[PDB]
Every structure is written in structure tokens, then in C-alpha cells.
Design a protein around this ligand. Structure first.
Ligand SMILES: COc1cc2onc(C)c2cc1NS(=O)(=O)c1cc(Br)ccc1OC
Length: 133
């Protein structure tokens, strides 16, 4: 038989939402700080780049990524959420950062470059979180 299963192909999942008109939203001092200080400082760090967009499993040849990671999250998504006032409180935003870090620790191994990057960003995150109003 001449069906060799070269199609259908994979794809990335759709990315997490950044707008939801029926979701309750507020602007708090803590969320403004999360955008103005926490996010915007992590974003400029030399280790931010793998975390600035959803994991593109196709491009990066990570065909198992979305077999393993069911709640993807990245700082591009977090940044678009903050810009769109998507959140109700700081806790929602913080859980997204925690998700992103945890995903990286699940998928990869202790000592991997990506994990060293994640660990460093998390360190800085935790320090900036201690300065929250
Ligand atoms: C194994 O490659 C990756 C694992 C990852 O877990 N989370 C993300 C995001 C992520 C990205 C890659 N691929 S990559 O090309 O961005 C990459 C980054 C580093 Br720092 C080290 C290796 C690497 O791919 C081989």
C-alpha cells in the first residue's frame, strides 16, 4: 500500500489567550509594577529570549514538547496579558510566571543550558517579587 503517512502533519497548538472579554479584569498597583518593573526587567535580560514567545515545537525540533507540556506559558503571552489588562490580580500574573518556569524544569534536565537560564531568571523574578507594593 502506497499510503506512507507523510501527511497529516504536526503543528503547534494554538497559543494561550491574551484577550477574553468576559473575564473579570482590574488595574492594581501590583499589576502595574509587574509590567513596569518585573516583566520589563526580565525581558531585557540576555537569558530572556527562549521565553519571549510560545514554544515553537516545529521550528525548534521539539516534537515531544506539547506531548509533555499541557499548560504552556511564556513571557510574550504574559506581556500581552499585562498590556491588555487581562488580569484581575497579581496572583494570576504570578501563576503564569510560575507555570512558565515549571514547564522548563519539567521538559528539560538539571544542568541543561535552558534550565540554567530559567533558574537565573527565576532568581531575579523572586528578588523583584520581594519588592512588590
Ligand atoms: C531543547 O531545546 C529547547 C528546550 C526548551 O525548553 N523550553 C524552551 C523555551 C526551550 C527551547 C529549546 N530550544 S532552543 O533552540 O531555544 C535552545 C535553547 C538553549 Br538556551 C539551549 C539549547 C536549545 O536548543 C537545542
Amino acid at each position: 500500500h502506497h499510503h506512507h503517512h507523510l501527511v497529516p502533519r504536526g503543528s503547534n497548538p494554538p497559543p494561550p489567550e491574551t484577550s477574553n472579554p468576559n473575564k473579570p479584569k482590574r488595574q492594581t498597583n501590583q499589576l502595574q509594577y509587574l509590567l513596569r518593573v518585573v516583566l520589563k526587567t526580565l525581558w531585557k535580560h540576555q537569558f530572556a529570549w527562549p521565553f519571549q514567545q510560545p514554544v515553537d515545537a516545529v521550528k525548534l525540533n521539539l516534537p515531544d514538547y506539547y506531548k509533555i507540556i499541557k499548560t504552556p506559558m511564556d513571557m510574550g503571552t504574559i506581556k500581552k496579558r499585562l498590556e491588555n489588562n487581562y488580569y484581575w490580580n497579581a496572583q494570576e500574573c504570578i501563576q503564569d510566571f510560575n507555570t512558565m518556569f515549571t514547564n522548563c524544569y519539567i521538559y528539560n534536565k538539571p544542568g541543561d543550558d535552558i534550565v540554567l537560564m530559567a533558574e537565573a531568571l527565576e532568581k531575579l523574578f523572586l528578588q523583584k517579587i520581594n519588592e512588590l507594593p
